[PDB]
Design an enzyme around this catalytic site. Structure first.
Site, PDB file in Angstrom:
ATOM      1  N   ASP A  92       2.982  -3.297  -7.027  1.00  0.00           N
ATOM      2  CA  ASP A  92       3.120  -1.866  -6.930  1.00  0.00           C
ATOM      3  C   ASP A  92       4.029  -1.433  -5.837  1.00  0.00           C
ATOM      4  O   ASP A  92       4.556  -2.284  -5.099  1.00  0.00           O
ATOM      5  CB  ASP A  92       1.796  -1.145  -6.919  1.00  0.00           C
ATOM      6  CG  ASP A  92       1.057  -1.187  -5.657  1.00  0.00           C
ATOM      7  OD1 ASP A  92       1.620  -1.595  -4.596  1.00  0.00           O
ATOM      8  OD2 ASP A  92      -0.135  -0.774  -5.634  1.00  0.00           O
ATOM      9  N   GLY A  93       4.339  -0.177  -5.797  1.00  0.00           N
ATOM     10  CA  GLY A  93       5.168   0.399  -4.775  1.00  0.00           C
ATOM     11  C   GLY A  93       6.481   0.863  -5.337  1.00  0.00           C
ATOM     12  O   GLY A  93       7.338   0.069  -5.681  1.00  0.00           O
ATOM     13  N   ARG A 108       9.023   3.950 -10.722  1.00  0.00           N
ATOM     14  CA  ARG A 108       9.323   5.373 -11.060  1.00  0.00           C
ATOM     15  C   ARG A 108       9.950   5.503 -12.456  1.00  0.00           C
ATOM     16  O   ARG A 108      10.480   6.616 -12.758  1.00  0.00           O
ATOM     17  CB  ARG A 108      10.229   6.012 -10.006  1.00  0.00           C
ATOM     18  CG  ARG A 108       9.680   5.990  -8.563  1.00  0.00           C
ATOM     19  CD  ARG A 108       8.432   6.882  -8.453  1.00  0.00           C
ATOM     20  NE  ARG A 108       7.837   6.879  -7.092  1.00  0.00           N
ATOM     21  CZ  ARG A 108       6.798   6.169  -6.731  1.00  0.00           C
ATOM     22  NH1 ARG A 108       6.180   5.340  -7.546  1.00  0.00           N
ATOM     23  NH2 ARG A 108       6.364   6.353  -5.470  1.00  0.00           N
ATOM     24  N   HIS A 125       0.846  -1.207   0.000  1.00  0.00           N
ATOM     25  CA  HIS A 125       0.000   0.000   0.000  1.00  0.00           C
ATOM     26  C   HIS A 125       0.887   1.265   0.000  1.00  0.00           C
ATOM     27  O   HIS A 125       0.622   2.259   0.683  1.00  0.00           O
ATOM     28  CB  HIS A 125      -0.975  -0.005   1.179  1.00  0.00           C
ATOM     29  CG  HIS A 125      -2.233   0.788   0.953  1.00  0.00           C
ATOM     30  ND1 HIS A 125      -3.439   0.150   0.782  1.00  0.00           N
ATOM     31  CD2 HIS A 125      -2.492   2.123   0.909  1.00  0.00           C
ATOM     32  CE1 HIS A 125      -4.400   1.076   0.669  1.00  0.00           C
ATOM     33  NE2 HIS A 125      -3.855   2.277   0.769  1.00  0.00           N
ATOM     34  N   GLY A 180       1.141   4.855  -8.651  1.00  0.00           N
ATOM     35  CA  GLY A 180       0.312   5.774  -7.899  1.00  0.00           C
ATOM     36  C   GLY A 180       0.830   7.182  -7.842  1.00  0.00           C
ATOM     37  O   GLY A 180       0.376   8.045  -8.647  1.00  0.00           O
TER      38      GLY A 180
HETATM   39  C1  LIG Z   1      -2.565   9.552  -1.658  1.00  0.00           C
HETATM   40  C2  LIG Z   1      -2.805   8.051  -1.815  1.00  0.00           C
HETATM   41  C3  LIG Z   1      -4.065   7.556  -1.677  1.00  0.00           C
HETATM   42  C4  LIG Z   1      -4.374   6.230  -1.861  1.00  0.00           C
HETATM   43  N1  LIG Z   1      -5.628   5.732  -1.794  1.00  0.00           N
HETATM   44  C5  LIG Z   1      -5.823   4.410  -1.986  1.00  0.00           C
HETATM   45  C6  LIG Z   1      -7.125   3.812  -2.002  1.00  0.00           C
HETATM   46  O1  LIG Z   1      -8.129   4.622  -1.809  1.00  0.00           O
HETATM   47  N2  LIG Z   1      -7.298   2.517  -2.239  1.00  0.00           N
HETATM   48  C7  LIG Z   1      -6.217   1.686  -2.423  1.00  0.00           C
HETATM   49  O2  LIG Z   1      -6.431   0.462  -2.587  1.00  0.00           O
HETATM   50  N3  LIG Z   1      -4.965   2.205  -2.437  1.00  0.00           N
HETATM   51  C8  LIG Z   1      -4.740   3.505  -2.256  1.00  0.00           C
HETATM   52  N4  LIG Z   1      -3.486   3.970  -2.298  1.00  0.00           N
HETATM   53  C9  LIG Z   1      -2.353   3.019  -2.565  1.00  0.00           C
HETATM   54  C10 LIG Z   1      -1.997   2.957  -4.048  1.00  0.00           C
HETATM   55  O3  LIG Z   1      -3.047   2.313  -4.765  1.00  0.00           O
HETATM   56  C11 LIG Z   1      -0.702   2.221  -4.310  1.00  0.00           C
HETATM   57  O4  LIG Z   1      -0.765   0.931  -3.665  1.00  0.00           O
HETATM   58  C12 LIG Z   1       0.496   2.946  -3.875  1.00  0.00           C
HETATM   59  O5  LIG Z   1       0.375   4.386  -4.123  1.00  0.00           O
HETATM   60  C13 LIG Z   1       1.583   2.421  -4.857  1.00  0.00           C
HETATM   61  O6  LIG Z   1       2.725   2.951  -4.687  1.00  0.00           O
HETATM   62  P1  LIG Z   1       3.339   4.226  -5.514  1.00  0.00           P
HETATM   63  O7  LIG Z   1       2.547   5.409  -5.057  1.00  0.00           O
HETATM   64  O8  LIG Z   1       4.668   4.134  -4.901  1.00  0.00           O
HETATM   65  O9  LIG Z   1       3.345   4.053  -7.004  1.00  0.00           O
HETATM   66  C14 LIG Z   1      -3.228   5.355  -2.142  1.00  0.00           C
HETATM   67  C15 LIG Z   1      -1.982   5.883  -2.288  1.00  0.00           C
HETATM   68  C16 LIG Z   1      -1.704   7.220  -2.151  1.00  0.00           C
HETATM   69  C17 LIG Z   1      -0.310   7.796  -2.324  1.00  0.00           C
END
Ligand SMILES: Cc1cc2nc3c(=O)[nH]c(=O)nc-3n(C[C@H](O)[C@H](O)[C@H](O)COP(=O)(O)O)c2cc1C
Ligand SMILES: Cc1cc2nc3c(=O)[nH]c(=O)nc-3n(C[C@H](O)[C@H](O)[C@H](O)COP(=O)(O)O)c2cc1C
Ligand SMILES: Cc1cc2nc3c(=O)[nH]c(=O)nc-3n(C[C@H](O)[C@H](O)[C@H](O)COP(=O)(O)O)c2cc1C
Ligand SMILES: Cc1cc2nc3c(=O)[nH]c(=O)nc-3n(C[C@H](O)[C@H](O)[C@H](O)COP(=O)(O)O)c2cc1C
Lengths: 333, 333, 333, 333
Positions: free
Chosen positions: C259-260, C263, C228, C282
């Protein structure tokens, strides 16, 4: 002084820059110099608890004499660079601490004068272009009462010391090689020395397992597992990283010492836990000499003795042999 | 100059920023560029002692000619960017040092002019959209007396060089591709080149073990284990990390060279201990050219020769073959 | 913009600090957030050479539709925080790039409006205290033409976001949850969703191997291996460190996304080489939205598409399936 | 306060430098102190998803009593150094949080006064030169209602605390050892204590596997796997690095606690995932005491309780036993 690092700071304050650099520096990029410290820093001891510590002793028997600690002063050339009393100051302090002192082929005071101080002197040998000169040094040492011959085997020639090159370092006119050119030594050379003396021959600068085994086969009494303080091959493995393998391979056939980066009694404990019979200490002894002469070296040896006793007891070891049975774990940074 | 890093500093002082960035940079985040150095820094050599060093030689035989060191000058495009004499300055210095020089398909002086300097010229080939142009370059090289064809196999197209993008870098009007578009090469291309020449074909840019094996099966005379100095795939493994595995897999079926980050004679020794037949050196040669032209390159080659001899002897190696039998240990930082 | 890091800088300039912190931050000490990057940085690809690259394609088939890249836009709540057009800007850009867009349960524009943009919309589900609300969201999504249900399984409740606590962060009055409380989901919940829809169910937030296997047994169509973005358990392993093990364990029984910290296109290549079917991205998508709205997201997707194609070809891969057969090596720093 | 690090900052502001150094410092170079943190930082948890979290409980049963968290307050000498209410403030807060409090042999308030606070008091024992004094302390503790005897086995004497040496640290005249010299304890000592009490005996400071096994054989009710917060042997392995091995070796024969560097509920979760029954927390409790007295400690315990519950649930664990079945992965930095 409460740590050996307090003495480094004090020596840096007093010595001329180029002499401090002669002392501190290594070859090349100094990778092997830095690695000696890194390698020790990654070793952790697994201490034992609840053992009898009624009579903790830091003594060892080595090369037929009792030493007060599992430590000797490494061979360091030209000690008058650091203090006017040079080698005699260090040898006196070593004697009074019960620690062997290694007299250098490149001593700035003659080997007979330093031997006359008393104590447990060893003699370090460089092989010379003129063989007979090297064999005459050995007989001189033996005649003067040295107790072991520490044959340096990692210096077919001196390494590339970039600090010294950049500084244009040269010996002051007031410092000379008082016992008076390097030739590569070979296994033949070792045999010539073994034949010319009754003293134990210790090969200093062994890093390969097979060279350790061959040293035993050659009749060495000991080896020093060492990269010459990072001053010879830049990129040579630290001795501490080869020690356990080497100890296992010789399987009690000769004494196995280590050097490079020992900066505390806890580091001595790490070395013994990895299997060393004893350690050599170089730079810190010179820091103490530069800072405060004979008294400085005495204070350093007292501090090391206290730290070795403290580490041993905290680790459940009433003797150095018990310390050699400790286990270790490699950790990170 | 007492290290290759002294030449980097001197080149940075003299070259325009965008040309220094063309030289220094890699693709993407430059992870593979940095990793080439990291990978070498973690390798330590286990030196041998007490061997005969009466006649230390740094010479090798490669592609039917004796070379003075286990080193060649890497192919670097557009050397007039760095000094007005460009490739002719470097080729002359290489010739006089007894080192092979790799003439580039993108040379800023024609391949026939550089070959006329003499020495041991090799020729690097890029496969072109028009195949016949590439095969004509090969025949030109052979007719001019080049001794090997170094087929670059890691450039189906050029990588994303962010420094060059940010600088808006373009060749000055005074620098051109004097031998006169990239097409992806395939194994078919290799065979077409093998069929069109009697010279050994060396595949540059191999990193996968199976591609090394296939190179031998394809009739290559050598490979260069290389990530193109971190300039192609950002995140490609350093060649030094694949070398030992590749050496084992080809099991003497072709020469195995390595490049990327070689910055000293000690690094050359590490590469040979891991099994390389020889290394290529790129950026440092250009630093020396930028700093001081032909004389600069000569001084760099003299410095490398001294450092290689020093490292070999300190490690107990009278020949490069002995250096290839050294063992290594991976260490930390 | 020549890298995704150029967009971070641009977003930081424009967004209010507390909104940038909502976006950037993780839970606790942010160890898992930092580890997502560290884990990718230690993976190196072993590229293949000399393959046919006449028709390199970055397309995949997933959940019954062709996607232009092995990438989808991750679910990110409340995108009107970043730009006034919020989710509609991002969804339009995704549609035009041929990339799936994940509509969030916490979208700041209703799921039916975003679905009406067209493209390949997926829908992310949070399980709610009132179950019927969650099952009604699923039917709404399906009725609106979403193509997969991305059930977030790592949020029994929200993690401790210390930046948000320190800032006293709260939604502006102008941003709401437009589709309208978390309840822990269980395997029962998954079955209730599986029974209520014909769409593939994708479990997002799987890290344990046995949970991956159980997901397949439960009838999931895919999983997202994910911590996450370091926002949930502080100290949770990065997904990239579990991916290869998980891919092996499911052995083709469902799609395995990760994910995660993605970049760059090179990071996409690393993920596919470790076995991923596709990645989610994300934070970078939100950086592009903040910097330049729909056009910003379009530019980011174009840049990623170029970097993915470049990395694939430089690694010898004419298709994503070939990229999944690449090998990797773990390196240092 | 939203993290335990907020309390460190607050304590550093208020305490005199030399008292902060008494609290913060370790022995020697502080390598073991730093390693306690490094070791925890490299452990990552593999959380489980989709489990029933309807009734998450952080309670454990230990030494015959229910504790509210898998945590106790470590023995820390001389707590009046930190706040005028000293031990009574901390014991009251512990009592109200349902956490065991360890009364020290070197408490600055008498053990009977602290026991009268109520709660779950344990008593920590130092072995003294006069044995009878130590055995009288044990009977005093038992008579006062302490529930376990925590025999510290890693302090044959105090380690070399260089901060305290450099500061010339000494107790203020207003702080005394209110229960009133160290003698090395042995296995004989343990038996003497076991024979003199019906309470469980817990050996604190075990790091070697064989000492853990011997503790079980000796009739210990528990051990604390610990390097004394890096205050004893400098270079001792962190307890967290030995824990999993020790847990396996005792195989349920006694409770296995760990300490050193626990700074969050996530760290508690890591310790339990590695097999700990519970943790001790030292420095942070004193930070909270210094910052805000009893109320400070209460706030710290509330914060830890929240972080433990949060971490457990995010990792899919409805009970501490489930947390002990989590798996972990070692990562980098
Ligand atoms: C601001 C923010 C809000 C997010 N909201 C959700 C969400 O509502 N549901 C969810 O499953 N993941 C949510 N995520 C997690 C993203 O889906 C994802 O797993 C994570 O951003 C991936 O990593 P990255 O940002 O490093 O690409 C959120 C992430 C961020 C940064
Ligand atoms: C200034 C200096 C001079 C040295 N001279 C010699 C020498 O003449 N013979 C020798 O065998 N080693 C010599 N050494 C190497 C030391 O004996 C020893 O191997 C090295 O200093 C050990 O590392 P340490 O300084 O880190 O304790 C010298 C070292 C230094 C720093
Ligand atoms: C400015 C520059 C231009 C290059 N041009 C070519 C080229 O035209 N052909 C080629 O095969 N490699 C080329 N290379 C790659 C080098 O041959 C070599 O693989 C790389 O520089 C080796 O690493 P080093 O620079 O770290 O020594 C180039 C490298 C640099 C720095
Ligand atoms: C100031 C201070 C005093 C301590 N006094 C004692 C003691 O009297 N008895 C004991 O067994 N441990 C003592 N310890 C060690 C702690 O019980 C514990 O092992 C260590 O603090 C745990 O690490 P932490 O502080 O990182 O949480 C002391 C620790 C500190 C910081």
């Amino acid at each position: 002084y409460v740590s050996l690092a307090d003495l480094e700071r004090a020596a840096r304050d007093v010595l001329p820059g180029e002499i401090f650099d002669f002392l501190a520096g290594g070859s090349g990029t100094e990778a092997s110099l830095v690695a000696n410290r890194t390698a020790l820093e990654r070793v952790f001891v697994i201490p034992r608890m609840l053992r009898d510590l009624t009579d903790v002793t830091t003594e060892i028997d080595i090369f037929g004499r009792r030493a007060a600690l599992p430590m000797a002063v490494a061979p360091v050339a030209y000690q008058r660079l650091f203090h006017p009393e040079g080698e005699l100051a260090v040898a006196r302090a070593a004697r009074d601490a019960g620690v062997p002192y290694t007299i250098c082929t490149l001593s700035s005071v003659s080997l007979e004068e330093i031997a006359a101080v008393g104590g447990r002197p060893w003699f370090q040998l460089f092989w010379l272009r003129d063989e007979k000169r090297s064999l005459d040094l050995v007989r001189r040492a033996e005649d003067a009462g040295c107790e072991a011959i520490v044959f340096t085997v990692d210096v077919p020639w001196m390494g590339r010391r970039l600090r010294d090159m950049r500084n244009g370092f040269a010996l002051p006119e007031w410092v000379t090689a008082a016992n008076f050119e390097f030739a590569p030594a070979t296994w033949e050379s070792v045999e010539a020395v073994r034949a010319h003396t009754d003293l134990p021959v210790v090969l200093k600068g062994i890093l390969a397992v097979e060279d350790a085994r061959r040293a035993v086969d050659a009749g060495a009494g000991g080896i020093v597992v060492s990269n010459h303080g990072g001053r010879q091959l830049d990129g040579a493995v630290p001795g501490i990283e080869m020690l356990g393998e080497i100890v296992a391979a010789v399987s009690g056939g000769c004494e196995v010492l280590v050097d490079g980066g020992i900066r505390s009694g806890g580091d001595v404990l790490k070395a013994t836990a990895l299997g060393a019979s004893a350690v050599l200490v170089g730079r810190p002894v010179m820091w103490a000499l530069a800072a405060a002469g004979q008294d400085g070296v005495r204070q350093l040896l007292e501090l090391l003795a206290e730290e070795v006793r403290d580490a041993m007891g905290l680790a459940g070891c009433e003797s150095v042999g018990a310390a050699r049975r400790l286990n270790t774990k490699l950790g990170v940074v």
